[PDB]
Design a protein around this motif. Sequence first.
Motif, PDB file in Angstrom:
ATOM      1  N   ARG A 138      11.404 -15.070  50.143  1.00 38.23           N
ATOM      2  CA  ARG A 138      10.226 -14.536  49.502  1.00 38.23           C
ATOM      3  C   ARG A 138       9.976 -15.086  48.117  1.00 38.23           C
ATOM      4  O   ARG A 138       8.831 -15.346  47.766  1.00 38.23           O
ATOM      5  N   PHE A 139      11.032 -15.358  47.354  1.00 41.75           N
ATOM      6  CA  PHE A 139      10.842 -15.952  46.034  1.00 41.75           C
ATOM      7  C   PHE A 139      10.181 -17.318  46.199  1.00 41.75           C
ATOM      8  O   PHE A 139       9.245 -17.658  45.471  1.00 41.75           O
ATOM      9  N   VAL A 140      10.662 -18.091  47.163  1.00 48.70           N
ATOM     10  CA  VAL A 140      10.217 -19.480  47.259  1.00 48.70           C
ATOM     11  C   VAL A 140       8.813 -19.635  47.852  1.00 48.70           C
ATOM     12  O   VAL A 140       8.134 -20.642  47.587  1.00 48.70           O
ATOM     13  N   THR A 141       8.424 -18.689  48.698  1.00 45.19           N
ATOM     14  CA  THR A 141       7.122 -18.757  49.387  1.00 45.19           C
ATOM     15  C   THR A 141       6.100 -17.885  48.684  1.00 45.19           C
ATOM     16  O   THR A 141       5.207 -18.409  48.003  1.00 45.19           O
ATOM     17  N   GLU A 142       6.310 -16.574  48.735  1.00 48.34           N
ATOM     18  CA  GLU A 142       5.345 -15.606  48.218  1.00 48.34           C
ATOM     19  C   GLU A 142       5.227 -15.656  46.701  1.00 48.34           C
ATOM     20  O   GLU A 142       4.125 -15.672  46.188  1.00 48.34           O
ATOM     21  N   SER A 143       6.347 -15.808  45.996  1.00 47.04           N
ATOM     22  CA  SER A 143       6.329 -15.869  44.521  1.00 47.04           C
ATOM     23  C   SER A 143       6.220 -17.299  43.968  1.00 47.04           C
ATOM     24  O   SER A 143       6.060 -17.471  42.754  1.00 47.04           O
ATOM     25  N   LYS A 144       6.233 -18.299  44.846  1.00 47.59           N
ATOM     26  CA  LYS A 144       6.184 -19.730  44.438  1.00 47.59           C
ATOM     27  C   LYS A 144       7.113 -19.994  43.255  1.00 47.59           C
ATOM     28  O   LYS A 144       6.735 -20.660  42.291  1.00 47.59           O
ATOM     29  N   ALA A 145       8.377 -19.605  43.400  1.00 52.03           N
ATOM     30  CA  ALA A 145       9.301 -19.666  42.275  1.00 52.03           C
ATOM     31  C   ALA A 145       9.552 -21.112  41.916  1.00 52.03           C
ATOM     32  O   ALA A 145       9.606 -21.966  42.800  1.00 52.03           O
ATOM     33  N   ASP A 146       9.722 -21.362  40.623  1.00 51.60           N
ATOM     34  CA  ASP A 146      10.155 -22.680  40.129  1.00 51.60           C
ATOM     35  C   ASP A 146      11.674 -22.863  40.234  1.00 51.60           C
ATOM     36  O   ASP A 146      12.168 -23.974  40.439  1.00 51.60           O
ATOM     37  N   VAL A 147      12.401 -21.766  40.057  1.00 50.78           N
ATOM     38  CA  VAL A 147      13.878 -21.750  40.136  1.00 50.78           C
ATOM     39  C   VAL A 147      14.265 -20.460  40.794  1.00 50.78           C
ATOM     40  O   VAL A 147      13.623 -19.431  40.568  1.00 50.78           O
ATOM     41  N   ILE A 148      15.329 -20.506  41.611  1.00 55.43           N
ATOM     42  CA  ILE A 148      15.933 -19.281  42.113  1.00 55.43           C
ATOM     43  C   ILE A 148      17.400 -19.195  41.696  1.00 55.43           C
ATOM     44  O   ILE A 148      17.983 -20.191  41.261  1.00 55.43           O
ATOM     45  N   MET A 149      17.901 -17.972  41.640  1.00 59.43           N
ATOM     46  CA  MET A 149      19.225 -17.689  41.064  1.00 59.43           C
ATOM     47  C   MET A 149      19.917 -16.569  41.843  1.00 59.43           C
ATOM     48  O   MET A 149      19.256 -15.588  42.302  1.00 59.43           O
ATOM     49  N   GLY A 150      21.258 -16.677  41.916  1.00 55.65           N
ATOM     50  CA  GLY A 150      22.105 -15.659  42.578  1.00 55.65           C
ATOM     51  C   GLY A 150      23.049 -16.293  43.608  1.00 55.65           C
ATOM     52  O   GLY A 150      23.180 -17.524  43.655  1.00 55.65           O
ATOM     53  N   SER A 151      23.729 -15.496  44.438  1.00 60.26           N
ATOM     54  CA  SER A 151      23.869 -14.054  44.301  1.00 60.26           C
ATOM     55  C   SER A 151      25.192 -13.778  43.573  1.00 60.26           C
ATOM     56  O   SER A 151      25.616 -14.605  42.776  1.00 60.26           O
ATOM     57  N   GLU A 173      16.716 -26.091  51.912  1.00 62.35           N
ATOM     58  CA  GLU A 173      15.661 -26.300  52.905  1.00 62.35           C
ATOM     59  C   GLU A 173      14.281 -26.288  52.253  1.00 62.35           C
ATOM     60  O   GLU A 173      13.464 -27.169  52.521  1.00 62.35           O
ATOM     61  N   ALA A 174      14.021 -25.277  51.414  1.00 64.89           N
ATOM     62  CA  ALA A 174      12.703 -25.140  50.750  1.00 64.89           C
ATOM     63  C   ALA A 174      12.533 -26.065  49.564  1.00 64.89           C
ATOM     64  O   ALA A 174      11.419 -26.256  49.069  1.00 64.89           O
ATOM     65  N   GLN A 175      13.631 -26.643  49.109  1.00 66.97           N
ATOM     66  CA  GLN A 175      13.629 -27.687  48.065  1.00 66.97           C
ATOM     67  C   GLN A 175      13.271 -27.074  46.700  1.00 66.97           C
ATOM     68  O   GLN A 175      12.262 -27.432  46.062  1.00 66.97           O
ATOM     69  N   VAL A 176      14.054 -26.056  46.326  1.00 69.76           N
ATOM     70  CA  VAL A 176      13.863 -25.339  45.071  1.00 69.76           C
ATOM     71  C   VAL A 176      15.203 -25.285  44.302  1.00 69.76           C
ATOM     72  O   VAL A 176      16.241 -25.019  44.913  1.00 69.76           O
ATOM     73  N   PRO A 177      15.205 -25.651  42.998  1.00 67.33           N
ATOM     74  CA  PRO A 177      16.450 -25.546  42.209  1.00 67.33           C
ATOM     75  C   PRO A 177      17.036 -24.132  42.290  1.00 67.33           C
ATOM     76  O   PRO A 177      16.303 -23.133  42.233  1.00 67.33           O
ATOM     77  N   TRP A 221      20.265 -29.204  45.850  1.00 66.10           N
ATOM     78  CA  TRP A 221      19.420 -28.254  45.148  1.00 66.10           C
ATOM     79  C   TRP A 221      20.146 -27.137  44.368  1.00 66.10           C
ATOM     80  O   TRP A 221      19.508 -26.448  43.557  1.00 66.10           O
ATOM     81  N   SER A 222      21.465 -26.988  44.577  1.00 70.40           N
ATOM     82  CA  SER A 222      22.247 -25.912  43.924  1.00 70.40           C
ATOM     83  C   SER A 222      23.162 -26.461  42.837  1.00 70.40           C
ATOM     84  O   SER A 222      23.722 -27.554  42.992  1.00 70.40           O
ATOM     85  N   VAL A 223      23.202 -25.744  41.708  1.00 74.63           N
ATOM     86  CA  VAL A 223      24.286 -25.882  40.706  1.00 74.63           C
ATOM     87  C   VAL A 223      24.915 -24.526  40.530  1.00 74.63           C
ATOM     88  O   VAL A 223      24.397 -23.491  41.028  1.00 74.63           O
ATOM     89  N   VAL A 224      26.138 -24.553  40.006  1.00 73.04           N
ATOM     90  CA  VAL A 224      27.000 -23.370  40.031  1.00 73.04           C
ATOM     91  C   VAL A 224      27.493 -22.988  38.626  1.00 73.04           C
ATOM     92  O   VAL A 224      28.022 -23.826  37.881  1.00 73.04           O
ATOM     93  N   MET A 225      27.260 -21.731  38.262  1.00 75.43           N
ATOM     94  CA  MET A 225      27.701 -21.236  36.939  1.00 75.43           C
ATOM     95  C   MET A 225      29.206 -20.907  36.901  1.00 75.43           C
ATOM     96  O   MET A 225      29.911 -21.383  36.015  1.00 75.43           O
ATOM     97  N   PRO A 226      29.718 -20.143  37.881  1.00 74.16           N
ATOM     98  CA  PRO A 226      31.168 -19.869  37.769  1.00 74.16           C
ATOM     99  C   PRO A 226      32.018 -21.109  37.883  1.00 74.16           C
ATOM    100  O   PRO A 226      31.657 -22.058  38.585  1.00 74.16           O
ATOM    101  N   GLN A 227      33.240 -20.996  37.359  1.00 71.20           N
ATOM    102  CA  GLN A 227      34.169 -22.127  37.362  1.00 71.20           C
ATOM    103  C   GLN A 227      34.612 -22.409  38.809  1.00 71.20           C
ATOM    104  O   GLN A 227      34.687 -21.465  39.622  1.00 71.20           O
TER     105      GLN A 227
END
Length: 357
Positions: free
Chosen positions: A58-71, A86-90, A106-112
Amino acid sequence: NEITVGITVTTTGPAAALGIPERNALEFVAKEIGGHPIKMIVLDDGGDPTAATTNARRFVTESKADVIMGSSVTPPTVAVSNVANEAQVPHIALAPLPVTPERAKWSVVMPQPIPIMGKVLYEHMKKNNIKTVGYIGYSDSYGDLWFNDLKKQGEAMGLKIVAEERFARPDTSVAGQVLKLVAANPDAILVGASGTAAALPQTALRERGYNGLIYQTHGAASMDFIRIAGKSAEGVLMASGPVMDPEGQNDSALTKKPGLELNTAYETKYGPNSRSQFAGHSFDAFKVLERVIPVALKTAKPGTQEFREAIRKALLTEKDIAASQGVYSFTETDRYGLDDRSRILLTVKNGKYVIVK
Ligand SMILES: O=C(O)C(=O)Cc1ccc(O)cc1
Ligand SMILES: [Pr+3]
């Protein structure tokens, strides 16, 4: 002209202790970046991979997010990364995960990354007369990452793995697993878990008369562990991000200032010792955005697929990103981007975290 960031974290269920600080830390990040307002959409996923998938979709389609984060934990983070790729969103992951070819673009990771945390623990085992090691951890990809690392690095360092037991995230007993670990009597035991669950083998092992050293992952690095484990927590060895102790850092550490900024804000609001590993990750994700957004804006405008690409390419070009948990430099193959500045070793003495130097 807003930049849209969709965030899915775990504020209900067994892993709430991780997602609640992550959500709470968002109060303290920039809501204007690069001269644009940030629109955040923050949803609970309850740690459930399907819910996380749904939120991310829903973030990537309905909200047209520029970046997504989690979980907040590995299974829903894998789900989010799969949507992102798949949706090609950072995607900025807030839990460690296996970064396969499917996930790396498309993913980068905050935890070590697990191996960095493992190495500090295993070097301590070697220094402290440990020859044999048992493992208890989740029966999922988080528990797998940790067990595999223990065996691969551990055996190369001449440790001998003598027992492996797993338990599920919602489990409230580990009686059968502890019986086997106690019978094997390894010199040390590594617990591969997080939050409230990490304290379950801690108490159960001590209650059953285990006297070896107990090691915990960075998944345990919040005050919840000391609250729940009590006296059983004493003497634990725990890998942690540096956000747990910015005061102790040299002024020359690029992590000190962001650590102090976060912790002063967080502990003023939420009280003494309320800092956590996890608040560090969502706060850091915005430090990352503050570097990459102005770069992406040079070539692209928010709300387009080009902006997604420009952010992805900026993640590769922008080096040495200072944050509370480390200094990040991502590459096409290293999606964690961290080094030795991203970890310290904690113990517990008299109900307080203390650095082991
Ligand atoms: O329980 C899980 O799956 C985790 O992934 C927990 C976790 C979250 C953040 C960290 O820095 C370390 C571990
Ligand atoms: Pr353009």
